[PDB]
Amino acid sequence: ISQFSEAYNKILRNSSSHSSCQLVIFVSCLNIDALCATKMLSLLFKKQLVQSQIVPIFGYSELRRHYSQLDDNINSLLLVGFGGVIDLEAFLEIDPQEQSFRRDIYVLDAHRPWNLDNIFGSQIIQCFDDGTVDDTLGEQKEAYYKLLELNDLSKRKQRKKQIHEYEGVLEEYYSQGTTVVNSISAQIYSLLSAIGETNLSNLWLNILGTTSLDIAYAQVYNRLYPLLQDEVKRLTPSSRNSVKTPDTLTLNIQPDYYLFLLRHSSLYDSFYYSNYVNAKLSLWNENGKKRLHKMFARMGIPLSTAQETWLYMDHSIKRELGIIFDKNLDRYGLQDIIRDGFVRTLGYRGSISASEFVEALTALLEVGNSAQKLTNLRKRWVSNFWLSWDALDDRKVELLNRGIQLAQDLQRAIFNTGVAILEKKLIKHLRIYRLCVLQDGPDLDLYRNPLTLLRLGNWLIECCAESEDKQLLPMVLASIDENTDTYLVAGLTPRYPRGTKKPILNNFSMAFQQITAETDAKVRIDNFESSIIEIRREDLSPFLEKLTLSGLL
Template identity: 55%
Template sequence: MLTRLFKTQLIQLQLVPVFGYTELREHYMKMDEDIKNVILVGCGGMVDLESFLSNDDDDDPINRSVYILDTHRPWNLDNIFGSENIICFDDNTIDDELQNEKSAYQKLSQLLEEEDDEEEEDEEEKDEEEEDDEEEETEREEGDDNEEAISSSNDENSNSKTEDLGIEKDEGDQGEDESDPKLRKRSNKNDSGKTKKRKKMKGIIHQLEKTIQKYYTQGTTISNSLSVQIYSLVSLLGETDMDYLWLTIIGATSLDNTYPQVYNKLFPLLEDESKRLVTNTSAEMTKTPDTVKINIEQDYYLYLLRYSTLYNSFFYSNYVNAKLGLWNENGKRKLHKMFARMGISLIEAQKHWLYMNNDIKKELGNIFRNNLDIYGLQDIIRDAFIKIAGYRSSISAFEFVEGINALLEVGDSSGDVSSNANRDKTVDNDYLPIDEVLEKRSKQWISNFWESWDALDARDHMKLQNGINRAKLLQAIVFNTGVTILEKKLIKNLRIYRLCVLQDGPDLESYRNPLTLLRLGNWLLDCCAEGSDDRSLLPLVLAALDTTTDTYLCAGMAPKYPRGLALERTEPTLNNFSVAFQLVATEINAKVKIDNFESSILEIRRDDLSPFLEKLTLSGLL
């Protein structure tokens, strides 16, 4: 959306994909000095960029404007209140929700400056006093030398004169050389006043720091869809059309699985905008093979229905799987009975959607309403955005997102994503140095990014089709791993979170990618939320062994609500692992790498995982 907008405005740009903070800083440091504007999309909002992007040899680190488009929260307060060169695009959360933090931040900055100034003054006073003491000591030594010289020659005369005048020598008279007691008392009084003032200032500083610390430790979340923010910018410039709207819908839909509250809040806004654009363009639109139309139609929580069979779309749906427990034989029997109850034969259900009986397809919604309540699947029907491109088949936004995500995970030219192909690659990697392995992965991820980028182009249907095919294979891999986890009871219900550690299995190498690990985590969380008798909302720690680097990729995921309850909630669930992971790793001095923009994902050395998890359990941070 942004690149298209810049091109229409004849603005030159370079797009650089980055996959972590290390790459972000490296690319920034290599940037040409002539580039004066940098836009960070989907990253940067949660770290102090002015410090992070600084050159150690440069007192003025930011010599260009850096714009942040990032919906990860919490904001780093230094970015929004403490820098003139960092410009943050906000979605009204700053004005609506951060006034207390803004006041605390500004007051704290002021007090810390005053404290620094006082410390500098004290240092200067101390230096002056030391200089005065040195001068007095020098004068005193010179006076003593003169006094000795005089007294040695006139000692007898002075004694006789003193006796003649009847004056007795008093040691107290020597006190006239010392400082005045009144001055000394006044000085002590001033010092006491300074001490009280500093104690009071430190108390205020402590309270302000607690306010800010509470804000940072509340947990992380996503506040909005980034694509919706960009669409607002496009609207201000009068550039809106169906292509912009579809990309906006894709971005918002991608949040539904993990942040359904955000998607549900945005759906009515996107629905209104879709109707507005259709109304404005329908009068002048003549249907052609390239005509693009966006409808709001009845859809279902089924997996890639238009690109699969009805049976498989039920079988691989996270929602249906969690409700019926399809990982065991009893769940499969329920599924078969359900089809019989709906009057759909298994032979018909296993036909590809394109070749399925049209009468069944047209009546599917009514069939579901009349039969699925008994199986607890009453929430299976939903509305969705459907893109219709000319005379070709339609695609829902949810299906489009699945195809794009799969290309991000495994790419288009990476061959088969089955376990055998991955295992062959692993054998090769086992004999490579770790640096070469990591470099190879980084190049693959960049390639995957451009594959998914190309698939966003409405004219390149084959890219998206390949992504959807890979999505089906990935979902099957996740399903098989999930079944193994549940059958072997690898999920441990600890006091404050659930834990699952993967150390072997035919598809273990698939979970070296954070996106695939999160895909599995969401599958497990859905099972915990929908399918088990224990509905306690516990978060999940999921770790998978990477034998090539001798580390675990570890993800901390917030708990999920059952789909029915999730639809009623308005606030997104906070993820507390971001802060907890960092604090625990620091406390036990574990060798970890927290480089992902999702700060609840880390890599940890194999030997450090057990003490890390033990400390996390006892930390009280969750």
């Protein structure tokens, strides 16, 4: 509810000290956006050389272990991606200490709607709600100034009728789907441009941030291109090349493709594993696989030349890469492939597509790495976080490729198993919504991570619906290996075929909390996201039955 620059000067005044500082910025959690945000944030701190503590939090339940344990001198705290949904004032408590409260916890979140207790009643925040939903948002505005603090019998009856009158519309609010308005990174950059830093790798961090989520909607991002492209116009390494030159040597616009790993993998394998194309062309089917080859017969690209790594393909095919696709792809309905994208060239190393980089980092997060076992695993993810954090750095590229050799493999897993599902037609159309469960599969170790099931779930909800009449219906998935029937189940959102009228607001967040409040059968919201929960095989089936009814949508 504040100016970004002024919130900045506040976090400046409470900061400096000695033995300074002290602030712990919480990077959270598994979302690439977090990295994108906190890296340019951390670089900004290093600019004024302000000491910081940076914590890789996984579990939402895990945050309590930290904040309740170690805090001493820390008067100014910062947090990322948490608290937009569940309020930490009740969760942490707080317990006001010393107006002009000593500690300011900044909470940065893209999630909506905000918790009601957060924005109004200033204690721990210093909210980041600005500027996306301001709004009004008159529904939260009347939620308090009316409620607080609230012949005489008719005035009591009138008063109470008014109270429930506000409580109904208030109940409409805060019970709702969790949907990201704008990427937190973008706003950190809006905060950053007011201070005056135009830095190139910074901007690349923004591009990374925005393009973190295009796998899932945009939704506003379709109109974020002005806010990026203009900035790309606010700077330039050289008016003209001047090949290369070995330095600056920076990012530029190119006809990029939702196509998967075009530059770091072989072309044919790049269609065959791509996510948008696995749908429209029915590639899980042997009968459709051929249709790809017909694409190549249309392009005049040899099959043998399609099998070869993209660095080494002939030059003629490169110069025709932006034409041939126009000549052909239009006929297959694949006409939405070509985006205007961002590509940063490091020169003699190669170039990297904005999206593919994100595929590298995601790749890093799950691989390349009774409560003791889950804690130890979540711990392994915590360590792995930094292995992924390092790849963002420019000076070490040598491990970034270790991401990509993984990012390929994962797909080779994901695709494979994905097909293993469609052969058995495991989809249960049900009535109100679509649902699935993986009872058996190869290498569930890869599927342990929330984000792995976010991408498999994504390639599957994308596959089932082209569309593909009728009625985009949200999907459900489940997997188990070890940790005694943890059976991780993540919520999902429907995918429109590039024509998106409504955000549609994932409802699993609410539907799960209704069940936690009913019989709560081995239901665990331990994962940071409201869409993804844990379950046991003993209680999963009654849970599934209680999921089927009553349907909130």
